[PDB]
Subunit: 435 residues, 2 copies
Amino acid sequence: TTPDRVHEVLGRSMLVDGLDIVLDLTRSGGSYLVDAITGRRYLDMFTFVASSALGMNPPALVDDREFHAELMQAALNKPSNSDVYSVAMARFVETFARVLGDPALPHLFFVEGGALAVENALKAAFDWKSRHNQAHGIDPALGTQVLHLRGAFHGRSGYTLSLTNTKPTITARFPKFDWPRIDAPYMRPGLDEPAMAALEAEALRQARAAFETRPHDIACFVAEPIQGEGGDRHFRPEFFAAMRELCDEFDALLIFDEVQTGCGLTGTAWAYQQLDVAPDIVAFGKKTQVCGVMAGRRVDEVADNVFAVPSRLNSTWGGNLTDMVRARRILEVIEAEGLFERAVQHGKYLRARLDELAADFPAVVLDPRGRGLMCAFSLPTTADRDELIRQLWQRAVIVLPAGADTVRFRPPLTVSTAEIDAAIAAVRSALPVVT
Amino acid sequence: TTPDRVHEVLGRSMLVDGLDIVLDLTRSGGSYLVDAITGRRYLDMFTFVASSALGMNPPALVDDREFHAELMQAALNKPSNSDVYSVAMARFVETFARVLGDPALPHLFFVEGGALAVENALKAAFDWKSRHNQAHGIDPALGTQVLHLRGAFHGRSGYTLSLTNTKPTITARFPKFDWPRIDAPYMRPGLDEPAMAALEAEALRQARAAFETRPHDIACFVAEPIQGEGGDRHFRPEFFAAMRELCDEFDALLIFDEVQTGCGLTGTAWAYQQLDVAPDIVAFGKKTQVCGVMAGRRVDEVADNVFAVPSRLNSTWGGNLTDMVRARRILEVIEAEGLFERAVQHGKYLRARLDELAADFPAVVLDPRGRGLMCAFSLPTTADRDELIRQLWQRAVIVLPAGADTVRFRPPLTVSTAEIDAAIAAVRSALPVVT
Ligand SMILES: Cc1ncc(COP(=O)(O)O)c(C[NH2+]CCCC[C@H](N)C(=O)O)c1O
Ligand SMILES: Cc1ncc(COP(=O)(O)O)c(C[NH2+]CCCC[C@H](N)C(=O)O)c1O
């Protein structure tokens, strides 16, 4: 079966709503996807929805003959890492701890899938709250609710469908828990310190009210440090620092969902490191290839927590061993080539270019924003946003929509300034056409 | 980091409650796991909890130099198959359809993880019921409950934690929906046709009562065709045929969870093919490597179902491309070497040997049972069962517990009769020690 027949074959069995190209697995490389049908090269600011750190076929992986042998050994089989340990697995875990570890969060747990990473973070919190309640003479039936934000996206699974609230298409007609949801006080243009502080104060009031009206029943607060799917909405560190204090006052865990922000994109291992707020638990995925949680801080105060008691958390495989081997090589490249720092520098460059765009097109390029390489801007209407994405597609630049009017950039950490310039050049060409 | 240091390294970050061995990825093969620490070979009747169809490093995979190149191409990267299609993906899908497909169930959907496969089956049913309700003048807020069995295991995720009911450790302190649960009328020794029929009639009465007391609100009935984790509990085809009629009478979908039974273990592609009951949806995983659902039958009667409307179901990756490439090669081996038929024949052999054991040890080897290679027996007490597993471990045979008193066999489809004899020889040696 042939590149020009891929869509026909898949269309017999599935809804085929993805891209019109067929990925060439061999010829794609770095910031470029190759369409196997035409041979056209596409500039990639999409990176499999922000899940590729180094882009396609990175040289450090492709040229490493020893790694080839390690990867092949892992790829031929699929052990249940839950039950059966290997050297390949242990090397991944120690390098994950070294490169991305936080000394306050020593407990690691791996699983396949971002939604399930978040769910295990939730399960840790539910167990923790119930046991903390029990230890202090409170009914252990209490501790089952999750405080969360409007505009959140945490996944499409049983628990995360009660949290995710972006597009109705995602959650409509699926049963949900009635969990408390508060306004998201994200930064918007033309609001100064005082106006921001007032916005935050109102979310915080809603948060406090939830805690007081559902006593001992809220196990945790979950947030994305920067909301991705909801529209690259950024929050001041002050908001989360206040939430941190409020969580502690009501004995609730703070969980950061770093599935989209994590693994270097904002310029640090984790976005929370720049906000200077310490979470009790972090859910990770996408760029990490294997998904999972890191936990500690207050979690350890309950001695029989989910990380200390056998069989409270599990899955058949405990993550994909092939993903672990690939991820450990990727982490070694990040560490050796200083890619977090490269993301800070190139992220400053991308951001500066978006600021220039805003100046040249004041009524059209709205709210340029970003942290590291996680950058975005918005258009006046969703029709404009949609049209700009199509115009870029015609020019062989792949970017992603978010929310109602946002265009987001998700370049690989290895993107060059010339590649950023090419993406920006395409946007400048397309904009007069959309206006 | 060295085989003898694997447990120490992992133990700094995780609960290390798995096996005392370290898997040698290279030297393991067929029905044998190799401990990298000692070089001792272990007879494998566990197969990464029934997730390996051909065992370790099968020759058809290891010796195939063209497949090596295809696997390597897939393993180096991890595309989002949700968005970006490839030839590798299309070849997997057409071979899955050819080898395991059912002409009544043409809609395929893939995802990482068995619990999420079941959840997507549930989501399809919730959407279907709500839309079917709406189309017939019934409130579309109705259709949110799942009828299911006692002793069921469907996963450890948000929706499946409301269904799974085996050991309290799995579900305790996690929030749940109040979904209707009925007795499981499984076959037990010393019950004849009439007594079985009475048992079934009572479950069916409970099922009917649930439907009548929760009108238009039960979207589906979910079952394992043979309950695995709950204790290899088998059901007569009559029970499911009656459930099939009852589902149709109340406009509810029937879903079979074949994550553990599927992909040839019982001697057919799917266990439901031997029960002669047509499901509307099948959840699969484990041996398939990639997980997912097949759907059709009544699903198609709602034209805007979840398989026809973009973005109702999704994940970042849409399954792991490396798993798809491996699975397609495994399916080709199954088809070429007649491994379903080999499972029927060797399954009859294993079963006959367990019958012999029951005769030689009448008060100790209870209820020998099986379908194909999915076989089991029970012991008088859980202390006896636990001790037998330890005694087998000392003799380098790996088997799994289930329920309170069951020992289950999960050999690879490629197991030989000499390997079955070796496992049986070990059980005969260990039994006098446990008594
Ligand atoms: C912030 C955040 N949390 C969890 C997830 C879920 O990850 P996974 O898809 O289950 O592996 C995500 C995923 N976000 C977007 C990429 C996939 C496409 C799209 N979100 C979808 O509609 O499913 C996340 O960003
Ligand atoms: C019948 C059945 N349905 C769903 C699942 C869930 O699959 P996954 O683990 O999410 O990939 C299973 C899995 N059953 C057992 C193997 C793993 C160990 C154990 N069940 C556990 O405690 O998690 C299944 O059998």
